[PDB]
Amino acid sequence: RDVVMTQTPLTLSVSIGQPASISCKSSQSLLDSDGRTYLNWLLQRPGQSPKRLIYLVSKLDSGAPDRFTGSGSGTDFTLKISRVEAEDLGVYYCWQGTHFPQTFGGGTKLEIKFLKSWTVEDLQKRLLALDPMMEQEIEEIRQKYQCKRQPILDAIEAKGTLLG
Amino acid sequence: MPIWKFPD
Amino acid sequence: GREVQLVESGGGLVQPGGSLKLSCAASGFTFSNYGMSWVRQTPDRRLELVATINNNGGGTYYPDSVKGRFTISRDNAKNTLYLQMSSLKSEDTAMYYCTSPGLLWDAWGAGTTVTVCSGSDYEFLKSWTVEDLQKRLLALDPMMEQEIEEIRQKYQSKRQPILDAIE
């Protein structure tokens, strides 16, 4: 039977600087026969691919800031943000790798409860992140209209009179 | 020391 | 830090019941040392692993939602991971990520988008003249043009408050 990862809360609205806490509860113990517990935490910033913050319950990814702490055991796991900054906003996912299928939590959206309090660098990063979001929406529209053209294009080609 | 798991 | 990179390709349109092959080129690390996985993100923003393979390629796993329809494989000499999708359904319309969680350096690709078309019946188009079909084909251009214009207006609006705050 597939392991179900129940992640809470679904949405968490915070002010910058406030702490945060995300919970992930497994329907089955995540302890492997080799003694390790394969439980990862990921953060998907808007317009970005998922990014690993924690592996093996508590090990901090070398590309993640020191404001995340992973903990837990067996079926109950927790991710805590000491202080929420602009970089930390996005959707968080817990990911268990002990059992196959290696299933994900449902996601936790960390959003803001205002730009006057933001540093120039944080405003710039927020501006920069909009570019990948825009081009991805454009690519989905181009694929959408590729689908709509296909039956018409094939009907036109089927009316040709050449052998090739 | 493995940090993840893949099929045997 | 060291530069590791994964690049997905091969995503695009595909008919229901059709087939599609995805590729993920790896660079910056010894590809043959690590297992790899394909993770997809549906429009409802949910993440799901669809295929995983160990480092030598002999061991693979697929979840039941996908088992029997996708086949993961790898060519270690070519530093490339593959996902062969067949008998595709509308549930497979998603963004497809390539990742290697065994790497200590965070390794995800930007993803490649797969769009499964409607599969609706278009047999009435065969009695149309070519000129009427081309008129129908051309009418999609102003529709797509409006959708792209909507996108750029959407992000022009989002940029304005942040730009004013920087000044």
Q: Find chain A residues with C-beta within 8 A of B7's C-beta.
A: 100
A9 within some domain: yes
Q: C-alpha C33: how far from its chain's center? A: 25
What residue numbers bound the domain in which C129 lies?
123-166
Choose the closest CB to B2 out of C52, C60, C102: C102
Same-domain status, A100 and A26: yes
Question: In this structure, is residue A164 part of a structural domain?
Answer: no
Cβ contacts (< 8 Å) between C64 and chain A: which residues? 2, 101
Nearest-Cα distance to chain B for A5, in Å, is 17
CB contact under 8 A, B7 and C104: no
Question: C52-59 long-range contacts, Cβ below 8 Å, gap at least 24?
Answer: C52/A100, C52/A102, C52/B6, C52/B7, C53/B6, C53/B7, C53/C81, C54/B6, C54/B7, C54/B8, C55/B6, C56/C32, C59/B6, C59/B7, C59/B8
- Residue A55 shares a structural domain with residue A31: yes
User: In terms of Cα–Cα distance, which of C98, C121, C100 is closest to C111?
Assistant: C98
Q: Among all chains, which residue has been given the structure tokens 């959206």?
A: A109
Q: Are A24 and A92 in contact (CB under 8 A)?
A: no
Q: What's this structure's resolution in Å?
A: 2.1
Together in a domain, C154 and C106 = no
C77 touches A at CB < 8 Å? no
Question: Considering its fold, how many domains does chain A have in total?
Answer: 2
Min Cα separation C162/chain A (Å): 6
Residues C84 and C146 in one domain: no
Q: Are residues C104 and C127 located together in one domain of the fold?
A: no
Contacts of residue C103, Cβ cutoff 8 Å, sequence gap at least 6 = C4, C29, C34
Domain residues for the domain of A119 are 115-159
Instruction: Indicate whether A14 belongs to any domain.
Output: yes
Q: Which of A3, A31, A36 to mutate to test the interface with B (most CBs of B within 10 A)?
A: A36
Name the residue among C13, C63, C165 with its Cβ closest to that of A123: C165
C98-115 burial, b at 16+ Cβ within 10 Å, e below that, comes to bbbbbbeebbbbebbbbb
Residue A106: inside a domain, yes or no? yes
Whole-angstrom CA distances from C21 to A81, C9, C34, C43, C164 are 40, 9, 21, 20, 45
Tell me, yes or no, whether C96 and C16 share the same domain. Answer: yes
Same domain, C95 and C138: no
Cβ-in-10-Å burial (0-12, 13-18, 19+) of A10 comes to: exposed
Cβ distance A130 to C158 less than 8 Å, yes or no, reads yes
Pairing of β A108-112 and β C5-9: unpaired
What residue in A sits closest to B7 (Cα-Cα)? A100
Same domain, A31 and A98: yes
Which of A40, A49, A138 has its CB closest to that of C97? A49
Q: Does A108 touch chain B (CB under 8 A)?
A: no
For residue A151, the number of C-alpha atoms closer than 13 Å in the C-beta half-sphere is: 17
Residues C19, C89, single domain; the answer is: yes
For residues A99 and A146, membership in a common domain is answered with no
**Do A71 and A15 lie in a common domain?**
yes
Query: Across the interface, do B7 and C52 touch by the CB < 8 Å criterion?
Result: yes
Residue A132 lies in a domain: yes
Sort strands C112-116 and A11-14 into parallel, antiparallel or unpaired: unpaired
Name the nearest CA neighbour of C115 among C9, C11, C13.
C13
The kind and range of the H/E element at A111 are strand A108-112
Q: Which chains touch B (3 or more CB pairs under 8 A)?
A: A, C
Give C95: exposed, middle or buried? Use CB within 10 Å, 0-12, 13-18, 19+: buried
Instruction: Looking at the structure, tell me whether residues C40 and C10 fall in a common domain.
Output: yes
**Same domain? C106 vs C52:** yes
Whether cis (ω within 30° of 0) applies to the bond prior to A101 is yes
Do C54 and C104 fall into the same domain?
yes
Q: How far apart are CA C158 and CA C152, in angstroms?
A: 10
| C16 shares its domain with C98 | yes
- Is residue C42 domain-shared with residue C82, that is, in the same domain? yes
Task: Answer yes or no: do C110 and C149 share one domain.
Answer: no
